[PDB]
Amino acid sequence: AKMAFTLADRVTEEMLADKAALVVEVVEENYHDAPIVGIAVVNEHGRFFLRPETALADPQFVAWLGDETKKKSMFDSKRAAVALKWKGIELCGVSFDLLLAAYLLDPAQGVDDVAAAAKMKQYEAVRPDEAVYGKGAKRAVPDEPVLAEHLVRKAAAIWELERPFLDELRRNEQDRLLVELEQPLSSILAEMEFAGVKVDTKRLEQMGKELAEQLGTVEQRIYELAGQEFNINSPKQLGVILFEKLQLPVLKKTKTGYSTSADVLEKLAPYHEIVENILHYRQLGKLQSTYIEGLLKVVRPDTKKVHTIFNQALTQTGRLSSTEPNLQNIPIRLEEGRKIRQAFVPSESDWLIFAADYSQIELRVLAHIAEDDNLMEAFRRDLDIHTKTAMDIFQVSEDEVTPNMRRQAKAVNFGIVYGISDYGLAQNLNISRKEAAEFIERYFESFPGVKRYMENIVQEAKQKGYVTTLLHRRRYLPDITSRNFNVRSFAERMAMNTPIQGSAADIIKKAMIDLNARLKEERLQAHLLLQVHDELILEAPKEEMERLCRLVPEVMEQAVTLRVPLKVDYHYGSTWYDAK
DNA sequence: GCGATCACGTACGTC
DNA sequence: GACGTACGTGATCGCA
Ligand SMILES: OC[C@H]1O[C@@](CO)(O[C@H]2O[C@H](CO)[C@@H](O)[C@H](O)[C@H]2O)[C@@H](O)[C@@H]1O
Numbered sequence: 001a002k003m004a005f006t007l008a009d010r011v012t013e014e015m016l017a018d019k020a021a022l023v024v025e026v027v028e029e030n031y032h033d034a035p036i037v038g039i040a041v042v043n044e045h046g047r048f049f050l051r052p053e054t055a056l057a058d059p060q061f062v063a064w065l066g067d068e069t070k071k072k073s074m075f076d077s078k079r080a081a082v083a084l085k086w087k088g089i090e091l092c093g094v095s096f097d098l099l100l101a102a103y104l105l106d107p108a109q110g111v112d113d114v115a116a117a118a119k120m121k122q123y124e125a126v127r128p129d130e131a132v133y134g135k136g137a138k139r140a141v142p143d144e145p146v147l148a149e150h151l152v153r154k155a156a157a158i159w160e161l162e163r164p165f166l167d168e169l170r171r172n173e174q175d176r177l178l179v180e181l182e183q184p185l186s187s188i189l190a191e192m193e194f195a196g197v198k199v200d201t202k203r204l205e206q207m208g209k210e211l212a213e214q215l216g217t218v219e220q221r222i223y224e225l226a227g228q229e230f231n232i233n234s235p236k237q238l239g240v241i242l243f244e245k246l247q248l249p250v251l252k253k254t255k256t257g258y259s260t261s262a263d264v265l266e267k268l269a270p271y272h273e274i275v276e277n278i279l280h281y282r283q284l285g286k287l288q289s290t291y292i293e294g295l296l297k298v299v300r301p302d303t304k305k306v307h308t309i310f311n312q313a314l315t316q317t318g319r320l321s322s323t324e325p326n327l328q329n330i331p332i333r334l335e336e337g338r339k340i341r342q343a344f345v346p347s348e349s350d351w352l353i354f355a356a357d358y359s360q361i362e363l364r365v366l367a368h369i370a371e372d373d374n375l376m377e378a379f380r381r382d383l384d385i386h387t388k389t390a391m392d393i394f395q396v397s398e399d400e401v402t403p404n405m406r407r408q409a410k411a412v413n414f415g416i417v418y419g420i421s422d423y424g425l426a427q428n429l430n431i432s433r434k435e436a437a438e439f440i441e442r443y444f445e446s447f448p449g450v451k452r453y454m455e456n457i458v459q460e461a462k463q464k465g466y467v468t469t470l471l472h473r474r475r476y477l478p479d480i481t482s483r484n485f486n487v488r489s490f491a492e493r494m495a496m497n498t499p500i501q502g503s504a505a506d507i508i509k510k511a512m513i514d515l516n517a518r519l520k521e522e523r524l525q526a527h528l529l530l531q532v533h534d535e536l537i538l539e540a541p542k543e544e545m546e547r548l549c550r551l552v553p554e555v556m557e558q559a560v561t562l563r564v565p566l567k568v569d570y571h572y573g574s575t576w577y578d579a580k
Numbered sequence: 581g582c583g584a585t586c587a588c589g590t591a592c593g594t595c
Numbered sequence: 596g597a598c599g600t601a602c603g604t605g606a607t608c609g610c611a
Pocket residue numbers: 029030031076079111112113309311312313314323
């Protein structure tokens with residue numbers, strides 16, 4: 001049972017219709033400067049397979065690819081677009097992306113290939129990529145006959161599934177979400193990934209040296225205090241030294257044995273001097289392994305740039321994720337690790353890094369969605385929200401709020417957003433369950449609208465089977481009806497949190513689209529480099545800083561209109577570290 | 581039997 | 596609440 005198709009040796013005009021399912025196959029997981037192993041086209045005139053070397057060298061085919069009036073339906077068009085950018089070829093006219101369509105229909109399905117998306121509509125006339133290419137290590141491109149049929153079958157599925165997927169998106173009121181938000185964003189992410197972020201490798205290498213020295217020192221000190229050498233990196237070996245040789249108290253256990261998380265070590269520090277050293281060692285080693293060595297491993301030696309890949313179809317809440325390298329988790333909390341940001345620099349001379357971030361976007365979204373009078377007023381006054389929460393739940397004036405009170409109020413705020421339970425809050429604040437329960441109780445008394453929302457949203461998830469965000473993104477919560485307390489509760493926390501985190505995701509994605517349109521209208525050279533959930537990082541000529549200081553915050557603040565204002569802070573400097 | 585690879589638990593970096 | 600990467604350790608793979 002083979003699918004019919006023409007294995008063309010040359011490109012013909014009927015392969016260039018103004019509507020087609022297109023496959024530009026890039027097998028390598030990381031598609032940056034990666035090989036395109038084959039091309040497949042399916043349109044009204046039939047199915048075709050084209051060898052990349054000839055198709056991509058064909059002026060007509062290249063022109064067709066770049067013609068915005070020639071509409072293409074694809075799966076993961078960003079992958080193709082970026083792989084083509086590295087070859088100096090522009091991809092335009094992508095009007096439908098099955099990966100993004102499937103993602104929006106149900107993020108939980110984990111659709112990562114055409115076959116997985118096709119199975120949603122009982123279409124199985126296509127094989128999963130893994131079945132054709134093999135897993136991880138044994139992952140190889142098969143001979144042409146096998147490759148060609150696979151690409152043609154994927155194109156054929158895309159061709160057949162577009163209407164069905166679009167129809168369901170329409171029924172879900174998500175058609176604009178795909179067409180006006182995710183698809184345009186995909187092209188923007190492609191530009192961002194392709195541009196990359198320049199790295200000062202000399203800076204990183206120098207940091208590595210000083211880290212190595214500091215590690216050697218702490219390393220020896222640890223052995224001295226332990227009275228013997230061992231693999232500090234090993235949980236088993238460490239636990240034995242700490243809880244057996246040194247007799248430290250076992251305050252927490254792990255499914256496998258002794259727990260040695262920083263949370264536990266801090267509590268053990270007063271008992272023995274080795275503890276602080278282990279914590280320090282943990283901090284330095286994390287920086288050395290994950291950020292210094294890890295980063296230098298992925299930097300391109302010729303341009304000294306790192307090109308992350310933003311997974312736009314993975315998170316259950318609509319957020320993006322970042323990989324190889326993950327540029328969404330570069331240190332900042334602690335000064336030592338924060339200095340790593342000094343290594344992220346502008347890509348051109350006399351340019352600067354510009355960073356803009358939303359101020360408390362999640363709590364502002366919560367105020368809007370819950371329509372809580374107290375919380376909305378708080379933001380209308382642009383109050384320090386943690387101080388305000390402390391005043392309310394602890395019943396004191398502003399000048400009566402102590403640093404510890406603000407710290408705990410802040411913990412409660414993070415918890416309320418996470419739909420946190422009394423135990424979750426108790427664990428984070430390191431207090432009792434009942435105590436944590438009282439804080440939550442006081443919070444709801446001060447913010448009745450929020451309590452009402454949390455109650456109503458859980459019931460809505462139960463009734464509808466899912467919850468939605470401002471721009472109609474959805475997340476199914478089948479566990480919401482489980483008779484298992486733990487499972488159901490987790491589903492409830494997700495019901496309370498997804499509309500918040502998800503709506504914040506919708507807003508910044510929209511801001512990105514609005515921003516790029518504005519930058520183009522103004523013909524600024526400034527361009528986006530990264531997005532870190534609630535912040536946008538750009539780079540631009542130093543001469544554009546003044547215009548960006550007004551333009552970026554405004555665009556981000558006006559992306560959507562809520563019942564409370566949106567507020568954006570911004571900074572700029574010679575490096576990402578300096579953009580503070 | 582021996583690298584190479586895979587599977588999974590633990591810890592920790594971000595918002 | 597949402598992520599990704601590095602590590603250690605035990606198990607399984609691919610071949611003789
Ligand atoms: O191209 C990104 C896009 O591809 C998927 C598979 O459909 O993920 C692949 O590529 C990522 C980037 O290298 C890898 O992290 C991932 O392991 C690989 O399967 C989608 O999830 C993603 O949206």
